[PDB]
């Protein structure tokens, strides 16, 4: 407030940080993958959620969720990562793209198969 | 590009008769109209304010045989044009060639008129036209070509048009399959049932 | 400490109307008589004087139609902290042209309606609804 105060010091616009550091406005990114493992969620949930540490190509080291039932990921295996928080595992703020690269499609799906990378029956 | 599914199903969901399967016979009484949209047809809908807007939009689309991409383009033209946005939406839809060919009586249904336009039968101002979306300008003369003139589908379909209301804005010869589009259609001349206001409400947000 | 005298005039009018008061005394000026007369000429105020030689006191006499006051709202636009000079075509119209905006133009102080026809703009002093 006070028009002279604004002349002297303008409105500093809130530079809201991005949720998903993949850098340079990239849709997806490759990851070599290390340590595929299970983890428990927060409070009202209780499960064994499948997740992996992704060694991204640009330098970053992030965790990414493995959606669907069952996966082929292990030890290494190069995978594709897209943005998206799970909102249950705190820290996990990415998703593995099922179908792309070494990550196969989910076995025996029918409904919603672009998600989970499965071809027609 | 087209619907090409169960056509009378669309009429039950919407409730009113959409003239999709109007055809040779006048009244259907052969679908359990109104009270059977699908399996759960006896379910009375709560039907929100967004619902009634969407139902009214999907009714006007399914009557005229237009998809959302081309229908949303009619709204963008309707807004930029003069007068009222509601009246422009429906005036542009009525000016389509497949719609005019139906209203003349050269097609029992609007899908039949669309195929008739598409298959080099229809001809306007001494020029053949394939496009159902062809905006028929004021003072025009749509007609059928002499090769496909008086074929089996048209003569029977023209006898149906006698039972219809028949628009005032256009005129038909009936002897030699020659039509004449005269003035732009008025709001009060046609329908008096499909609400425009709710379709303007869907797109403005 | 008394930077804008014109805003102070327009508060005494506004607060006098809230109190249901008959007359509103204050220190006079050149710009005070000019604004007060424009309010009178259209018909927000019902008569005024400038009684005094050495220390003049311009007192207005506020108008009331019903129990409600005549001046619905009145506010300073071109305050001294931020002067607001509007162009001929860019002149405002308060309440869609049934309230006035007192505008100091080159041919004396006048209303926004008279400024349009006279063919000039200026410093928009105050909106009066």
């Amino acid at each position: 407030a006070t028009v002279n105060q604004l002349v002297r010091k303008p409105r500093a616009r809130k530079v809201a940080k991005s949720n998903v550091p993949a850098l340079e406005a990239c849709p997806q990114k490759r990851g070599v993958c290390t340590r595929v493992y299970t983890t428990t969620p927060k409070k009202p949930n209780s499960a064994l959620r499948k997740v992996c540490r992704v060694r991204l190509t640009n330098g970053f080291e992030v965790t990414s969720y493995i959606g669907g039932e069952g996966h082929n990921l292990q030890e290494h295996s190069v995978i594709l990562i897209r943005g998206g928080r799970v909102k249950d595992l705190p820290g996990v703020r990415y998703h593995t793209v099922r179908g792309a690269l070494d990550c196969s499609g989910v076995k025996d799906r029918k409904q919603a198969r672009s998600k989970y990378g499965v071809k027609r029956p | 590009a087209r619907y090409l599914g169960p056509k009378l199903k669309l009429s039950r969901r919407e409730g009113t008769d959409l003239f999709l399967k109007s055809g040779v016979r006048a009244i259907d009484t052969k679908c359990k109209i109104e009270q059977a949209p699908g399996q759960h047809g006896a379910r009375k809908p709560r039907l929100s304010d967004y619902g009634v807007q969407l139902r009214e939009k999907q009714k006007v689309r399914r009557i005229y045989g237009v998809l959302e991409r081309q229908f949303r383009n009619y709204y963008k033209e309707a807004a930029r044009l003069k007068g009222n946005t509601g009246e422009n939406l429906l005036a542009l839809l009525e000016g389509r060639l497949d719609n005019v060919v139906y209203r003349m009586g050269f097609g029992a249904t609007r899908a039949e008129a669309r195929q008739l336009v598409s298959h080099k039968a229809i001809m306007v101002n001494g020029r053949v036209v394939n496009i159902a979306s062809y905006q028929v300008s004021p003072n025009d003369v749509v007609s059928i070509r002499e090769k496909a003139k008086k074929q089996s589908r048209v003569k029977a379909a023209l006898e149906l048009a006698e039972q219809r209301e028949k628009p005032t804005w256009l005129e038909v010869d009936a002897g030699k399959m020659e039509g004449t589009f005269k003035r732009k259609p008025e709001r009060s001349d046609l329908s008096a049932d499909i609400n425009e206001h709710l379709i303007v409400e869907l797109y403005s947000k | 400490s008394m930077q804008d005298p014109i805003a102070d005039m327009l508060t005494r009018i506004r607060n006098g109307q809230a109190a249901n008061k008959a007359a509103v005394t204050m220190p006079s000026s050149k710009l005070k008589v000019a604004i007060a007369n424009v309010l009178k000429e259209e018909g927000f105020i019902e008569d005024f004087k400038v009684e005094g030689d050495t220390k003049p006191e311009l007192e207005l006499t506020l108008k009331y139609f019903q129990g409600k006051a005549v001046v619905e709202s009145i506010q300073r636009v071109s305050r001294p902290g931020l002067r607001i000079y509007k162009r001929k075509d860019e002149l405002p119209k308060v309440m869609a042209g049934l309230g006035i905006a007192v505008v100091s133009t080159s041919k004396g102080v006048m209303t926004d309606r008279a400024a349009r026809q006279a063919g000039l703009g200026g410093e928009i002093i105050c909106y009066v609804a």
Binding site: - | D49, G83, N84, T85, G86, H197, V200, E201, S204 | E42, G43, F44, K63, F65, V70, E72, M95, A96, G97, L98, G99
Partner: protein
């Protein structure tokens, strides 16, 4: 001259020794479609009993709105609690482009086309009062003419 309609229904709790008892609140606005508006709150134990209780209060709690043809006279604010509410008259074209609750009150009042927006909080009760505070306040040229004692044409033209 009914033109009655419901804005919002909302269940509300009390809490007692035994447990918590739920009642429902309605919010109906009614009008003739020609410069008469009236919101009515109404509450009851059951849902449909609450709306009849609301519709009864709405009819009696009516306010007059002097409006031009089928639209407002001038751009008008009307603050209430945490709802600012702004709405401009607009021309003969368009329709009511306003939020839900804010456009229930407008359409039944009889304004056919206006610009509008609810700033601040958008509590259905307070925004309906915010509009009616504005529409009650919204004076006409005929009122302004008599208020000053000059002329209807000399003010307008």
């Amino acid at each position: 001259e009914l033109q009655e309609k419901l804005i919002a229904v909302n269940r509300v709790s009390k809490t007692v020794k035994g447990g918590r008892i739920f009642s429902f609140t309605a919010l109906t606005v009614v009008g003739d479609g020609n410069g008469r508006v009236g919101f009515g709150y109404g509450k009851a134990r059951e849902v449909p009993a609450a709306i009849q209780k609301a519709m009864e209060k709405a009819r009696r709690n009516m306010i007059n709105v002097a409006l031009n043809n089928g639209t407002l006279q001038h751009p008008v604010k009307g603050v209430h609690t945490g709802s600012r509410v702004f709405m401009q008259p607009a021309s003969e074209g368009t329709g009511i482009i306003a939020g839900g609750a804010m456009r229930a009150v407008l359409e039944v009042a009889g304004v056919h086309n206006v610009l509008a927006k609810a700033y601040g909080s958008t509590n259905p009760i307070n925004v309906v009062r915010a509009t009616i505070d504005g529409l009650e306040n919204m004076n006409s040229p005929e009122m302004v003419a008599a208020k000053r004692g000059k002329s209807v044409e000399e003010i307008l033209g």
